[PDB]
Design a protein around this nucleic acid. Structure first.
Lengths: 555, 411
DNA sequence: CAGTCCCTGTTCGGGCGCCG
DNA sequence: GGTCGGCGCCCGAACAGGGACTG
């Protein structure tokens, strides 16, 4: 067997474990013909070699159809090998995005063929890549081969190819520094600001530099004229857009179908602004079977129809211009949902997106807005390596009030206010000093861990009082209920004294939404008030009326 | 032609496998230029996917510095080689460094590139350089010499370092020199003028052996932040409730604190804004508690075998308080920072500056870096903290969310 | 005192989408 | 078909760790 012009990556097994010894699956007669036809061809080209009984290893093998072609692809079930092979550190850290490309005079795209089959495998490792090819007769012993290249289906093949490919491009990129080469597996986006005459020269020079190592660049996949098909997009000299997306039109929707729907809906949200998947993801909660038919809710059918109406109109993105600033603007779409658009010129969106993670049981719009900004910041640094300037639907004074008074560290990069309702604001402000002339409520609440019963109430300085029996509750729910009572039976200005750190830690965070209905009722009463002062005192210390109301709600 | 010191991980532990976070453009261009240069000087060499280990890498600019500096987050590797630099080749900590009038820090990380690293250990120093928009796959490297920011580097170079410092330590015996990570702390009681001169004498004393910085500290002017009670002449119900809550919380530190007579003033169900006169038994319980807060806590002392822990509280208006301890309520040191860079506009910058100042103080006093309890969300911190880091070391930290309770450390 | 449990947050396992 | 790797989303489950309470 000849030596492959590319250097080979040394691969070991994990210490203490031997190669795989798995029996072959029964294969359909149509797949056996496709395998023997491809086996016998790769052995002629020096890619697989025969092995005798001295190789005690074996692994299953099968074959699937190629997309839009009569050819078949050979795949090996290395699930037992991959467990015992050494761990690899992948060199693909993410996926390129067209919004990060710069306008170049000339653009060329090519795709080498049978990529993994042009890179050798380590010599000392070929013994563990042994497999059997079952013949048309079950009594025939079968032909046994071993791989000489990267087997399609092995966990080290993508890692090894990307690193081997980068090593071959380095001498070209070192000699041609002004040539931009976007390398993602076997596909090379090549662009330059050189004239179209000296462009094609450097293209041919690469196609020969790649040929010297056994990498063929067929003219069938060569692309010299726009539009270019790169990474699932359509690259034009001035704009770009995703390749057409097709949503299922199922009359009876199963859980898996929504999952394929949602997954697609996401894929689109990167350029199609305004995609909402709130009510559609509400169908995937608490469900167990992937094939369990599920009826669409009224809110989900409306959300789907809107999304189908957005996919009808054509949308497109632009490219990154380093000379002009990066801008990102966010809007408040649904409760718990956010969308954004990244652009440099008005209405010329580089890309869009959405953020909707519900973080925590109690939160407000300001928290979710800060979480959204951070998600955009990281994503932007991935694609453009810089933080965009932000246009936020929150008043400057609103945000200044929040971050200065919040006990956690919080910050937003350079941003400016945009008057696009609905505006994010704080729905209530707790006073910092007790209110003069306001009734003072000493609240407390307790419950029994066994009976699950408790009381909650208050005592005021004007003699007012209340105690309410509560059934199927906890100590925390009662202390919260006691505060809800004080808010109900008080005027517009009220001073409230509690001994519950749990209740005080939730309210001081100024939440406007909560997963608990009792908190939402407390929020609704807090918005109706003009001035509210909360205070904490240690319990069981005989403090004010907090000890008098502790003894009333004791049982 | 130098012999390599053999190093091994701690028993029963694999190398670090931490993913590389996304980097900005100005950082990637700085790492490329440095790494290409370090590759040309043989300090590093390219590797492949067969190495399953990786460590994050980013770049910084020290205070009032224009040149970028390569920095590696070897916190995970240092945890997995802890027995080497503490048991076999430990460095003593001078208890007099914190008593000097002026201490200066010197980046000596460039000297570690003169000593080759053990061949079998180079596999764990692996790191990956990302590209913008993932144009190219990860450009991986590994170290061929003593890496900057690794705890095992100053321990191997210690024998060589002592011989370089001996001619200067003999001429200047009263000067204290400590070495932590890639920095060298030189403290002296000399006047500020002749102090900086002796620094330049050292700087040239290290240039002749094959090695520059300048950050002055004044550990003798370091103050602590005690717990203080208000000196009001007219006390309202609310004032007394806040006072009792604060005294009740402070009782976990000073067992001698009592709130019996003050709680007696809070018997009736009174309005918060109502003024209450302090009884004779309460004015004495208040004055006695002010004196107990003047006394030092009983039974507090540093334990070298225990990990340091630091808590930070945002007090607003550019105010930040901190406490260092090993056992709860046994605070080795307290303090407060104000008017740091980014005050009144940026809270992550202030929190980043506060961690660096606290860590620097912990190195001068005990020679250890504390584990921080940061008052910030995890996602907020991990997004911006690298944009304000100006130090060659990186402490450990965790994220807490304690609502304020009774403002115990700041009035 | 040490054990719970009430609550809240994080990490992870598993489904699509996409790319080669 | 029921291969690999990368990234993204959504969900529940498992695990975690703090606070108040009674044995």
């Amino acid at each position: 067997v000849p030596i492959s012009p590319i250097e080979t990556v040394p691969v070991k097994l994990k210490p203490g474990m031997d190669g795989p010894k798995v029996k072959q699956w029964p294969l359909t007669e149509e797949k056996i013909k496709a395998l023997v036809e491809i086996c016998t061809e790769m052995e002629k080209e020096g890619k697989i070699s025969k092995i005798g009984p001295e190789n005690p290893y074996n692994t299953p093998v099968f074959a699937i159809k190629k997309k839009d072609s009569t050819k078949w692809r050979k795949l090996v079930d290395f699930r037992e090998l991959n467990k015992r092979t050494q761990d690899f550190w992948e060199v693909q850290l993410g996926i390129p995005h067209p919004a990060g490309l710069k306008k170049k005079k000339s653009v060329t795209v090519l795709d080498v063929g049978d990529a993994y089959f042009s890179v050798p495998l380590d010599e000392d490792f070929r013994k563990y890549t042994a497999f059997t090819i079952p013949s048309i007769n079950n009594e025939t012993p079968g032909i046994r081969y071993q791989y000489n290249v990267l087997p399609q289906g092995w966990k080290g093949s993508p890692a090894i190819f990307q690193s081997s490919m980068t090593k071959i491009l380095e001498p070209f990129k070192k000699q041609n520094p002004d040539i931009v080469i976007y390398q993602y597996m076997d596909d090379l986006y090549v662009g330059s600001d050189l004239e179209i005459g000296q462009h094609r020269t450097k293209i041919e020079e690469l196609r020969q530099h790649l040929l010297r190592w056994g990498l063929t660049t067929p003219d069938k996949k060569h692309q010299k004229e726009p539009p270019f098909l790169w990474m699932g997009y359509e690259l034009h000299p001035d704009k770009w857009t995703v390749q057409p997306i097709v949503l299922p039109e199922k009359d009876s929707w199963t859980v898996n179908d929504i999952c394929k729907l949602v997954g697609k809906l996401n894929w689109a949200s990167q350029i199609y602004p305004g995609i909402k998947v709130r009510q559609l993801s509400k169908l995937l909660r608490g469900t167990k079977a992937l094939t369990e038919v599920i009826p669409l809710t009224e809110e989900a059918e409306l959300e789907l129809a809107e999304n189908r109406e957005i996919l009808k109109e054509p949308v497109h993105g632009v490219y990154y211009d380093p000379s002009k600033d990066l801008i990102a603007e966010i809007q408040k779409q649904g409760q718990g949902q956010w969308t954004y658009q990244i652009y440099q010129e008005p209405f010329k969106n580089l890309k869009t997106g959405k953020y909707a993670r519900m973080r925590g049981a109690h939160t407000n719009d300001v928290k979710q807005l800060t979480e959204a900004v951070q998600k955009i910041t990281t994503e932007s640094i991935v694609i453009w390596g810089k933080t965009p300037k932000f246009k936020l639907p929150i008043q400057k004074e609103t945000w200044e009030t929040w971050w200065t008074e919040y006990w956690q560290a919080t910050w937003i990069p350079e941003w400016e206010f945009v008057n696009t309702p609905p505006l994010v604001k704080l729905w209530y402000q707790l006073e910092k000093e007790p209110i003069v002339g306001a009734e003072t409520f000493y609240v407390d609440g307790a419950a029994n861990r066994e009976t699950k019963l408790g009381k909650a109430g208050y005592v005021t300085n004007k003699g007012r009082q209340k105690v309410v029996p509560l059934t199927n509750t906890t100590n925390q729910k009662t202390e919260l209920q006691a505060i809800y009572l004080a808010l109900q039976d008080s005027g517009l200005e009220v001073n409230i004294v509690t001994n519950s750190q749990y209740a005080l830690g939730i309210i001081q965070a100024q939440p406007d939404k909560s997963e608990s209905e009792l908190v939402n009722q407390i929020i609704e009463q807090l918005i109706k008030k003009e001035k509210v002062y909360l205070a904490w005192v240690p319990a069981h210390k005989g403090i004010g009326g907090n000890e008098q109301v502790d003894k009333l709600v004791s049982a | 032609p130098i012999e390599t010191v053999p190093v091994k991980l701690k028993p029963g532990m694999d190398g670090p496998k931490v993913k590389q976070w996304p980097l900005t453009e100005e950082k990637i261009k700085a790492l490329v230029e440095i790494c290409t240069e370090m590759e040309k000087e043989g300090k590093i060499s390219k590797i492949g996917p067969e190495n399953p280990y990786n460590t994050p890498v980013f770049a910084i600019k020290k205070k009032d510095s224009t040149k970028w500096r390569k920095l590696v987050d070897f916190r995970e590797l240092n945890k997995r080689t802890q027995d080497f630099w503490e048991v076999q080749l430990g460095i003593p900590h001078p208890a007099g460094l914190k008593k000097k009038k002026s201490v200066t820090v010197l980046d000596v990380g460039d000297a570690y590139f003169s000593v080759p690293l053990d061949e079998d250990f180079r596999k764990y120093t692996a790191f990956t350089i990302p590209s913008i928009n993932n144009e190219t796959p990860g450009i991986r490297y590994q170290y061929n010499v003593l890496p900057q920011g690794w705890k095992g580097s100053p321990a191997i170079f210690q024998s060589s370092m002592t011989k370089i410092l001996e001619p200067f330590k003999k001429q200047n015996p009263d000067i204290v020199i400590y070495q932590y990570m890639d920095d060298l702390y030189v403290g002296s009681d000399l006047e500020i003028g002749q102090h900086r001169t002796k620094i330049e004498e050292l700087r040239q004393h290290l240039l002749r052996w094959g090695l520059w910085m300048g950050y002055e500290l004044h550990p003798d002017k370091w103050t602590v932040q005690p717990i203080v009670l208000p000196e009001k002449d007219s006390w309202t119900v609310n004032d007394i409730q806040k006072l009792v809550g604060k005294l009740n919380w402070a009782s976990q530190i000073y067992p001698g604190i009592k709130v019996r007579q003050l709680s007696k003033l809070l018997r009736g169900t009174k309005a918060l804004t109502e003024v209450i006169p302090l009884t004779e038994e309460a004015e004495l319980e208040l004055a006695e508690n002010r004196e107990i807060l003047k006394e030092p806590v009983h039974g507090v002392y540093y334990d070298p075998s225990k990990d340091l822990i630091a808590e930070i509280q945002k007090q607003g208006q550019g105010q930040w308080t901190y406490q260092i301890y090993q056992e709860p309520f046994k605070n080795l040191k307290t303090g407060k920072y104000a008017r740091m860079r980014g005050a009144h506009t940026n809270d992550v910058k202030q929190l980043t500056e506060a961690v660096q100042k606290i860590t620097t103080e912990s190195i001068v006093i005990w020679g250890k870096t504390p584990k921080f309890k940061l008052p910030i969300q995890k996602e907020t911190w991990e997004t911006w903290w690298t944009e304000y880091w100006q130090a060659t070391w990186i402490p450990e930290w965790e994220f807490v969310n304690t609502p304020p309770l009774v403002k115990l450390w700041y009035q």
